[PDB]
Subunit: 475 residues, 2 copies
């Protein structure tokens, strides 16, 4: 009946990011990233966890790729560490760093795994922060572009799928609104101005990609939480409308149309928070149209009316204590509300597989572009059993349900080209430590003890192995 | 909040068959509604538009009341069978002179005319000949009728509406059988809509040649969709409802393309329209200057099983609580919004929904917006002092105009606001007892009485709104 098969060459994938897996933070000439620094600030990370060693993927990448081949992955998404390539962020390139990702790519291609290369996954070189304030300076447009072009030249003959900026919205919100990411700022004006420069750097890098990799495909990976209204009360609908415009269309309109949504822009102008548009900005932004929209999906968010004296800031759950997450909002615009109809994880992330289908349809309907799920997964506590296995049936249940809704979205007509789970191995959660695990492959370490870093295939590894073998026929 | 724009079009609206009368005079051909209203059971208590309110003969009196109100704009409809009695033959000059004298009357009082090309009164001859909008021949005949109007009045009329409520009219025409041609067939519904889209685009393409300084757009019967709850199944129902009830028409009007999700579904069902060669190229030529918005209510939707609700009875009697739920099995069903009040005809009162709907169209399509209809239809009585205290109507219009100011402050490009309606008139299916007018008309379903014109309390309230440019 409705169990229609997935497309024959659907990109069954999994994903990682450099800072979360690589370790070797100060080896072979690598320069400091802003996270090499930020994780050393007391209280910024869970129980002092950092990526100095992470899961040692830089030295152990062949073991991990062999696990990907055992899995049968059709695609593997990874990011390149900018300060591993340019230790000072610009100027002289680090051949050891270029050689590492060159070897990684050849190892992947040997197993018929498509590389999906993320250009920017939050690890700005500290030298560029020191020099001119990172994304708060328009100088970053030229420096980010020069970095991207270096990779386009060396890897573009072999790598077809590229991601430009990863979760600009989420990363910059924590960087400039909540101060939970570098640079640790709480200022709405700076937030929108830094986002504006990041949009410019995205569009410049994509324009360059059209010339250096004309047969390639590129897009941003957006941190996507479709908005729900709490009720059919018109005030709650209007809160949902505002949330959709401010939290989703602000980035998605700019990425896909090259323009800002008018309703948020006019509101920001009155509050003094709008980005400054300089001469030539709109002409550059018009050149950044992507081949696909990368979707990082974990949960929907439900919204309700928020008075002018209402909620703004709230404390995030970074401990795994269920129900401790606090609501947030923009006074006069909207506030979050726990969805009463949804189960949540121990980190209070809502489990909403139908929301994935809803979100895929919304982007498909509004912008008419192909979609690529570049992240989807469940972060949970894992235990190793007496027989050495990890019975992560909760993770299988989550991934199964979301893959079922991917099938239905494909039935609905969305052009979904692939699906990358987060994450392939266990890795460092930026703010939640190593105990919030997402991997198919368990890594034996804790927050401050690396132990032996042993790789152990979880039960979800074998489930997804079978999903790929059957092209999604079985779950 | 920002004041209303300097040249904001404060207007009121009507439609030809609902006000004109004179159904068999000066050589006027038979409309599809002239025949349909004679069928027993199709109209409330047998009401018809043979006389209506006799605006044909009493147009100078009606226009005199618009000048007293200080209307900046007046939206009226031209009867196609009055211009072309057979639809496609020679034109009737008496009909062209009538609307000539009507427009001239409006400009003599500094009222901007807004001309609606088609307002559901298809000439019966075209139904007899090739079946109206079920034949691609209507594309040429409708264009020929539009072009004739472009030449005569194009110098005096700058604001035009192409097709009025294609979705609402065609749904009752081919799904519920409550409008002509009394059909209940999904395939015919989408085929007829598809030809209407082609006629719309052809007429707009011709408009750019003959009226290069004018502005034109369709008037869409717009009910923004709500989900009943934050249950994902109910959000999905709302998503389906928006695509099928709204994007199907709005994507076509503004983008020239059907939304992919409804199209794939309709293809699998065998209900999709056949897209012939030349269709997409023509449809790309019909981009409007503005989207005309007919707003009365929002609709709230919930999950609907495959064996679930389909057809439902409509409230045409004014007995509150008699409207039944409808839907599309497996996609969505309507559910009365527990947070909204309703009229005696079960139409939901949702002024904030107008702001929400204006923002949605503005966000998705980026086009100027023109509210071409908005009003409350309710029972009216005449007091002993000869007045009509329709404070319920004032309350409705006040709330919606407050939300129009908020939408303008938000950034929506709202160019005007036409109330429905200026004088009392025949509701197609609800008779004369469902009154929307600023001006009361003394008549009922079976008795013409004297068709006296009596100004309601809402008449003076709107008079003050225009004088103060919406400040009060």
């Amino acid at each position: 009946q409705r169990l229609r098969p997935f497309p024959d060459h659907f990109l069954w994938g999994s994903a990682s990011a450099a800072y979360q897996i690589e370790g070797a933070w100060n080896e072979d000439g690598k320069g400091l990233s802003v996270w090499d620094v930020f994780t050393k600030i007391p209280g910024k990370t869970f129980k002092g966890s950092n990526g100095d060693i992470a899961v040692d993927h830089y030295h152990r990448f062949k073991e991990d790729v062999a696990l990907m081949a055992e899995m049968g992955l059709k695609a593997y998404r990874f990011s390149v560490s900018w300060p591993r390539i340019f230790p000072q962020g610009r100027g002289e390139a680090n051949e050891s760093g270029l050689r590492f990702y060159d070897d990684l790519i050849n190892e992947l291609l040997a197993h018929d795994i498509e590389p999906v290369l993320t250009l920017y996954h939050w690890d700005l070189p500290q030298a560029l922060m020191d020099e001119y304030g990172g994304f708060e300076s328009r100088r970053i447009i030229e420096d980010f572009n020069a970095y991207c072009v270096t990779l386009y030249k060396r890897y573009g003959g072999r790598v077809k799928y590229w991601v430009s900026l990863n979760e600009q919205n989420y990363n910059f919100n924590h960087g400039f609104i909540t101060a939970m990411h570098p640079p640790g700022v709480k200022d709405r004006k700076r937030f929108y101005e830094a986002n504006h420069i990041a949009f410019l750097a995205n569009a410049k890098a994509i324009d360059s990609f059209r010339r250096y990799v004309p047969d390639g495909k590129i897009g941003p990976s957006f941190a996507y939480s479709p908005a729900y209204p709490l009720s059919s009360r018109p005030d709650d609908i209007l809160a949902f409308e505002n949330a959709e415009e401010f939290t989703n269309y602000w980035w998605l309109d700019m990425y896909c149309r090259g323009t800002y949504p008018d309703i948020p822009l006019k509101y920001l102008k009155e509050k003094g928070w709008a980005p400054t548009i300089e001469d030539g900005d709109m002409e550059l932004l018009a050149k950044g149209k992507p081949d696909f929209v990368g979707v990082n999906y974990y949960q929907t968010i439900t919204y309700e009316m928020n008075p002018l004296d209402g909620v703004s800031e709230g404390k995030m759950n970074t401990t795994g204590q269920k129900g401790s997450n606090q609501e947030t909002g923009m006074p006069g615009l909207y506030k979050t509300k726990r969805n009463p109809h949804l189960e949540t994880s121990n980190w209070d992330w809502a489990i909403d597989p139908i929301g994935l289908r809803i979100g895929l349809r919304r982007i498909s309907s509004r912008y008419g572009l192909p979609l690529f799920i570049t992240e989807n997964g469940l972060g949970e506590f894992d235990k190793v059993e007496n027989d050495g296995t990890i019975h992560d049936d909760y993770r299988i249940a989550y991934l199964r349900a979301h893959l079922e809704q991917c099938r239905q979205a494909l039935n609905d007509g969305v052009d979904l080209i692939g699906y990358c789970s987060w994450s392939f191995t266990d890795l460092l959660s930026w703010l939640n430590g190593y105990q919030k695990r997402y991997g198919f492959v368990y890594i034996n370490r804790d927050e401050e003890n690396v132990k032996d870093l042993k790789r152990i295939k979880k039960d979800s590894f074998y489930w997804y192995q079978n999903v790929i073998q059957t092209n999604g026929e079985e779950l």
